[PDB]
Design a protein around this ligand. Structure first.
Ligand SMILES: [Cl-]
Ligand code: NA
Ligand code: NA
Lengths: 117, 68, 58, 93, 92
DNA sequence: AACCGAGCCAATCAGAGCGAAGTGATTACCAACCCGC
DNA sequence: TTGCGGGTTGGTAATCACTTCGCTCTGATTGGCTCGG
């Protein structure tokens, strides 16, 4: 249920991720959400979905969920990847740093076609 | 006007025809699922009888090596 | 071992089918990205009044 | 990682606002009551049919599980009796 | 349908990455383009699992509940139980 | 020593949003007819 | 032949939603230089 948080993550790297998800959950339970203000534009999320010609009609909700879900996705991966860079003494987040983080958890096994071994 | 009022009918007619189609479908889905399983239950009863006879033969043989 | 996540595996293969089919319909020959998209912005990027270090300004 | 028990509220059901007013005739009132019932009774026999399906689906899963266990119990009894017999056989001579 | 419809805007994806990391950090143009491709697949991946399930019940509309189901189905329990709170505050 | 690259920058204009129209879905009403009592 | 109560119909009404096209204002695109790495 919450096993994906520190999956392939140990040391102080496990706490920082759990600390994030907790901050996420707390601000999802707390602050008044403006469902117009979004870091990722709703219109394009719908286009990415409607890029699959199997999908026809989409509820206004799904884009709004994906907008937040993607924000939290990008942020956790970037952080996971950022550890790999600091372990290898780098200030620049490389493609390999991301790749390296995707192999840590079996949750990212859908991206293997985007970034092969 | 008639362009929408009579369309509302065409879209309702569709509703009743879809609901009348699902009630019939799911009624026939019960006949299949209850028959398909009436087969499976009869298949296992065939195995139990054969497995039981197989036990009885092997128990009679081990009985033969002890029955003296 | 090399055994992947079973929950996704079934959907991962389904995507490979849809992902391949689309790439052909898009008429896209190259696998790599383009250097730019919009010519008006590219043309505005040359017209662009710059400084000595290549930074823009007005 | 902890969260509270959050429940998704159902999306607002579509259709025509149910008439707030009471009809001023008992003859059209009992009509309304009996017709309103008809719309629920019909809508219920298709709703209750998913329960009929999922009852069979679950009641048949339990009986299948009993057999698949019962044949494995009777399968191990054969595999037991074979080797046990094999011992008596060898120890006889 | 265009070609770059299958991706989200790179500058938007990049901006979320800048915020995730310290101010003194830098992010490879390759790494940004990788993230863009990733997050864009994350959408299409979850959508397809919600799309087929909807075609079984023979719906046309794909609703947020269908998304939250598809997430738990593809082992995104954490995401599903997080966005469950976002949808509940939305619907009221 | 040799190389590779991300920040830097702020104006263009392709799109993000917004609302309107359209159509579908869904629930509710009713007059009319039937049936049992 | 009265009266009472329930079922059924087709037709209308009402609310929610989903799309498409139009207008507006935004913020994503944009590359050449430096110093780092
Ligand atoms: Cl905080
Ligand atoms: Na935050
Ligand atoms: Na917030």
């Amino acid at each position: 249920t919450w096993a994906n948080v520190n999956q392939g993550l140990q040391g102080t790297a496990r706490d920082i991720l759990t600390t994030y998800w907790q901050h996420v959950i707390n601000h999802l339970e707390s602050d008044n959400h403006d469902y117009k203000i979004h870091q990722l534009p709703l219109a394009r999320i719908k286009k990415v979905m409607k890029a699959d010609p199997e999908v026809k009609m989409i509820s206004a909700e799904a884009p709004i969920l994906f907008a937040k879900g993607c924000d939290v996705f990008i942020t956790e991966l970037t952080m996971r990847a950022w550890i790999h860079a600091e372990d290898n003494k780098r200030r620049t987040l490389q493609r390999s740093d991301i790749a390296a983080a995707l192999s840590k958890s079996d949750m990212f096994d859908f991206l293997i076609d985007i970034v092969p071994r | 006007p008639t362009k929408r009022k009579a369309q509302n009918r065409a879209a309702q007619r569709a509703f009743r025809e879809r609901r009348a189609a699902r009630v019939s479908e799911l009624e026939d889905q019960i006949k299949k699922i209850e028959d398909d399983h009436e087969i499976h239950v009869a298949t296992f009863k065939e195995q139990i009888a054969n497995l039981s006879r197989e036990v009885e033969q092997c128990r009679t043989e081990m009985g033969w090596w002890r029955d003296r | 071992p090399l055994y992947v996540n079973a929950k996704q595996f079934h959907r991962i293969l389904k995507r490979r089918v849809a992902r391949q089919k689309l790439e052909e319909q898009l008429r896209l020959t190259s696998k790599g990205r383009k250097p730019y998209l919009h010519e008006s912005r590219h043309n505005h990027a040359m017209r662009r009044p710059r400084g000595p270090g290549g930074r823009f300004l007005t | 990682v902890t969260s509270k028990e959050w429940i998704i509220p159902p999306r607002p059901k579509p259709g025509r606002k149910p008439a707030t007013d009471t009809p001023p005739t008992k003859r059209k009132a009992q009509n309304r009551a009996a017709q309103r019932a008809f719309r629920e009774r019909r809508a219920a026999r298709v709703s209750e049919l998913e329960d009929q399906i999922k009852k069979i689906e679950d009641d048949h899963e339990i009986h299948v599980a009993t057999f698949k266990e019962q044949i494995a119990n009777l399968s191990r009894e054969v595999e037991q009796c074979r080797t046990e017999m094999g011992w008596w056989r060898d120890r006889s001579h | 349908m265009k070609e770059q419809d299958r991706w989200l805007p790179i500058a938007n994806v990049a901006r979320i990455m800048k915020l995730a990391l310290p101010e003194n950090a830098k992010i490879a143009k390759e790494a940004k383009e990788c993230m863009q491709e990733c997050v864009s697949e994350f959408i299409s991946f979850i959508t397809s699992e919600a799309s087929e399930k909807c075609q079984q019940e023979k719906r046309k509309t794909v609703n947020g509940e269908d998304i939250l189901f598809a997430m738990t189905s593809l082992g995104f329990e954490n995401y599903a139980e997080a966005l469950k709170i976002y949808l509940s505050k939305y619907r009221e």
